[PDB]
Symmetry: D2
Subunit: 337 residues, 4 copies
């Protein structure tokens, strides 16, 4: 039995020992320590060699991405890409540390737009009327000028032209994940999550890709250049197959909604994820999927019964960079060369 004890600053500021002390500090600090242990267990599993029998069963996807002993799904809500967690996610993707991304439409487009123009710090309480009068859009305590989206429109419209031509003359059947790969290739910028995702053959799923500025642009585009089709059915096969043919899976989910359920539902197709860490601020009392505890997912088979899932009830803008510092970033050498 482990005793409660906080970090003793009479020892000075030993930042690694201070982070390790979250485990015995209690409440959500203890859940953070548990989440570090779970993520490190996913990484240790991922780095374990595939046996010949395992290699066979998991080679049954024709994905150009080499298979590992643990397929890690990373999900995050759109606002976390508006935040500086965009940099944290880009790092993991750049170094092949996760295998599948799931995000909503804002989580795609704002990564691309940040390569064209920055997002600024503001405050939650700024009044919408005066903001609108000055052409400034608010995302929490962040601020995106209208001109950011104009730049986006000028960048994106020629690409949508090529996509429709390739659809109509080369037989391409677009889906959200294929479009996201193409946009990451086009942005051609190492600061972009989606640039690294397509470079590293990491598929990105986003079934409601029309729900944001990218949809605005497709909509306007469709009046000049009609007929672009985005099929979500093929993308459902594609994400589900990533789970079905995995040796092991881990889920790391920041926030709730479509991103959380879509990853969990893919893992239900294999009778459950082996490891699961949730960081989100939602609560269960309203019945929502977003606020459901991991144990709700156990009843469905989204998480295996012998898994030890962890939820940290906190804003991921605080927790996720600390989690990455104590896990993936310490095993970085294993992910390179």
């Amino acid at each position: 039995s482990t005793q409660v004890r906080g970090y003793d600053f009479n020892r000075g500021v030993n930042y690694r020992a201070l982070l390790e002390a979250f485990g015995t500090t209690g409440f959500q600090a203890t859940n953070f320590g548990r989440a570090v242990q779970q993520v490190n267990a996913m990484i240790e599993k991922k780095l374990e060699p595939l046996s010949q029998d395992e290699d066979q069963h998991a080679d049954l996807t024709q994905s150009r991405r080499p298979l590992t002993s643990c397929t890690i799904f990373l999900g995050y809500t759109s606002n976390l890409i508006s935040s500086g967690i965009r940099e944290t996610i880009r790092y993991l993707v750049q170094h092949n540390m996760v295998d599948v991304l799931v995000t909503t439409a804002g989580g795609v487009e704002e990564d691309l737009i940040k390569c064209l123009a920055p997002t600024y710090l503001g405050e939650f309480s700024l009044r919408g009327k005066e903001l609108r009068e000055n052409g400034i859009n608010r995302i929490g305590n962040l601020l995106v000028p209208n001109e950011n989206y104009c730049k986006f429109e000028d960048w994106l419209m020629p690409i949508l032209d090529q996509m429709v031509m390739e659809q109509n003359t080369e037989g391409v059947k677009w889906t959200p994940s294929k479009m996201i790969a193409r946009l990451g290739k086009e942005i051609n910028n190492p600061e972009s999550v989606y640039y690294w995702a397509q470079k590293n053959h990491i598929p990105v799923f986003s079934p409601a890709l029309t729900d944001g500025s990218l949809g605005d642009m497709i909509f306007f585009h469709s009046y000049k250049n009609p007929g672009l089709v985005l099929d979500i059915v093929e993308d459902l096969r594609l994400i589900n197959t990533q789970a079905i043919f995995a040796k092991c899976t881990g889920m790391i989910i920041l926030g709730g909604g479509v991103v959380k359920h879509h990853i969990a539902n893919a893992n239900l197709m294999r009778n459950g994820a082996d490891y699961a860490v949730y960081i989100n601020t939602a609560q269960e009392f309203d019945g929502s999927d977003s606020g459901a505890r991991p144990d709700e997912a156990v009843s469905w088979g989204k998480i295996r019964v012998d898994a030890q899932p962890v939820k940290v009830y906190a804003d991921a803008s605080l927790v996720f960079p600390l989690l990455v510092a104590e896990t993936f970033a310490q095993k970085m050498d294993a992910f390179m060369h």
Copy 2:
């Protein structure tokens, strides 16, 4: 200036007077009274006397186009009946829900959902083939019945796509499933009967997705396009005379309605009931004033958010609004 004063139970129990008194009780009771006022303003606008080629829709235009959105779990709840009533009587014009909010309305025509508790342990539920949704319970067998019912319909859909030129989208699929369920307890039976479109751009994220997925290995090729559905919802906003938004919960269902209304530079009326909070920067938790900065809500509008579980507040809101003006819809 309005004084704070609660309902006086020395009057006895007049429930209408009791609900009216929420307005002067303060905190979220006061926001509830403001929400009643805003929804009654949408209805009164809708009822004022007064396109199909530009919206590609058969639904006639009224003086206020009302968009109703709700998360999936509210269809698991008994709020399913509240929503079905509004759709049955043609009181709203556009529905947005996520996939669970489509499929569980259909499954409830085949088998019931049951009351349970939030604390029931997942291992024992899983061993007994029972799935938990909050404090509700759905036996596995409900999804078996759903599968049996759905597979021949998916067969017809693929046949119609490949030989009759049908280009399926979520809203077109949802209309077809409501027609097929053919049951007056179903929200989507009434929506298609009354030509109320239902948008659900991630319709694959749930059990209908599972079923489409399994079905595709037996009968391949169904496609669901989300682009045409984006044109259909956006033009519902663009060509409206006025618009109101009533949004239960957060996520895709809230943003998708607000973004359609951004296309007309903003909704005229807006009422939110949701439990999310702003501090995590989320769109779900954003106050209505964030949407004003984007132009999703007009600067002159008077939007209202009630911070509460909609399973408590939405039946009361409907009692004091739509259900009072039933003669006009009738």
Copy 3:
């Protein structure tokens, strides 16, 4: 097994049937139905006659309040007295429907001040600087003018003078509950909770009575008329004895903090309350007593193991008048004559 089914408005607006349908609607509506059942079980117990053996054991307090088969503790946070729930609480107290009140200092003083000047509706977002510049204090979306407290000061200072004289020349040993009874007698106004509480011999406990405007006034008073003593130890004996010698107890607690723990801790002295209904918006993840689920209280013995406690996660300004409508208000005839 009970099926989920909401109220069907094709039946018209039958408000009683609509409230009854919360029970099968799910999420917090179902918890509301459960809370109605629990409160009605407290009332049904309270109205059951005392047997001679029970009458004996419970007559062992020298309280002038006649003993019943279920002693009900009603607790509420200060802001709920700023709200119109003040009227709901006054009704229950006026008709002897509950037996012990617990509230914090704002929950005492603002009931008295509402007899001198009203509280007004405002908005949460009004800016503090301009409010302060206009002498208006904000409580959530409510507004209290400075002049309300001036009126309070003019009303209260003569009473504090008498209290010190009675302490120093008549041997009175003041405690929060004795002071609250005296203030309710002095306000002499049927709109006041504390007026009815002292009329009906319902004790009010508030151990941190100095934490608010009443404390401000005692503080200033003490420089002109020193030495007023408020003992909290005697009041601890007094609340605890209400629980120890009860036949049965019920707890109805609106909100968290001192009010919730102080009632629960009194019931721990009898190895637990028989019935418990909580209405509060706090959540458990931060470890707080305020956000603790009823089941945490079971581990201590604050709630009996065979009790069926209920928590409704909601703002009590919405829920509590509905709860009272479906419970105490329907049994009003039993509480009169």
Copy 4:
């Protein structure tokens, strides 16, 4: 205008740089960086070079009087050590906590608290004599040890009241208990040694209350007066040169500090870390701008609230503030 940008792990792991980057990461990470700035401004003010009869206190005045408040459960947590460190080094001037936040610091000198889980069932815990606090566990035997330790001290207190004229209050009792526990792991041992007063106006609401209650039937007559303690805390604010408030959690501990600062027309600096939200009208959930309307915070101050569990954020805040300026306290 500051651009949004997260820490770049291609730099490797420099934890100081990682914490600095919270400022430009957004949402509550940005509020954390603002909280570091405000606490460092209080400390820098306190360290500027520069009554006992009017405050009735032996503690010398500095250029910034800092009030630290925390709820009881944070002393159940390992934040007890963080708080003990600040008090041990005389870094804050006034403590406010509720009764659990006094007694569990003393009990931890007698027996440990253990890690558990939130979901552990109360019936089985109760059958095993284990009490739950969030995901922490306190065996009944800890309170037996507390009783044995406390009873002879309560005896001395009653004797001193009745024959040496002592007029006990919560703060005077807490000072005596810290002296008696005589253990350098204890917050309150350090507070009395360093003449930092601790205010707790509902000190009866917890296990020390239970013990006082039982003790009074064996040795009657102890009185705890809260009026003199109100004069003592209020005069700490009134005669300060400047004040800052650092408040972990909500309830009595937050209001009691803010109300003392209302007496001087408002604190100069204020940092809140709490999980409560405003919508229910509560004082716990009130934003700092509500306190500005009352005059509890000066209109020119720049207060900061971080919406987060303090068990995560407070050790990081101390790392970047007080623990960096340790040489000046030393």
